[PDB]
């Protein structure tokens, strides 16, 4: 157990890296503020489709479908909890948001 | 089903209308003919506001430190009521960028 949850921890370690050019998700009406938004979107589940691809046919399904659940759990808990600490959000912010 | 499917078209009407200002009738609506014009026309407006974006000269004192709207944005804003998602945009911008005898830049979008 303690040798996987290890690979976890590392995985973990990735994907928030990845999500600091997010820029706290603000000022979405800056064409830069957009794209630098988008740039870690696309990275953030490109790392977990590889990963996925990696791990098929070797955990057993229950513990597969279970580890992608967390890690995904903490792909967007970090998303919701930007978007809710937000202060203006404007007809373009909700539209690209 | 009936509902649906009349809800759909008054749907693609409204946002054809607000987005666009083109007002007709439901036969030049329903025509795909259009509809495919209107599609390469701001495919083609796509392709000039990011051509016009790669720098052919110096930079003007626009957008410093106040940053404009994407134009992408908007051409979504408009393609969200032709249903043309980023891929399909891509696709077309690659072949568009052939036919204008750019390799790199059709390349790049395939290797992306």
Redesign the interface.
């Known amino acids: 157990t303690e040798c996987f949850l290890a690979q976890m921890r590392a995985q973990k370690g990735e994907l928030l890296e990845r999500l600091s050019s997010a820029r706290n998700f603000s000022n979405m009406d800056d064409e830069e503020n957009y794209s630098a938004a988008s740039k870690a979107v696309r990275q953030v589940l490109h790392q977990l489709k590889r990963l996925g691809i990696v791990w098929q046919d070797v955990l057993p399904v229950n513990i597969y479908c279970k580890a992608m659940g967390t890690l995904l759990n903490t792909a967007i808990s970090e998303v919701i909890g930007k978007i809710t600490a937000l202060e203006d959000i404007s007809t373009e912010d909700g539209d690209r948001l | 089903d009936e509902c649906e499917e009349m809800l759909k078209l008054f749907k693609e009407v409204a946002s054809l209308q607000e987005n666009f200002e083109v007002f007709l009738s439901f036969e030049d609506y329903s025509n795909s003919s259009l509809v495919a014009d209107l599609r390469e026309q701001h495919i083609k407006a796509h392709e000039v506001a990011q051509a016009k974006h790669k720098p052919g000269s110096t930079p003007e004192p626009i957008a410093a430190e106040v940053?404009?709207?994407?134009m992408?944005?908007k051409l979504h804003?408009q393609a969200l009521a032709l249903q043309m998602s980023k891929q399909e945009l891509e696709a077309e911008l690659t072949l568009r960028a052939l036919k204008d005898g750019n390799i790199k830049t059709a390349l790049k979008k395939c290797s992306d």
């Open positions: 940053r404009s709207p994407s992408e944005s804003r």
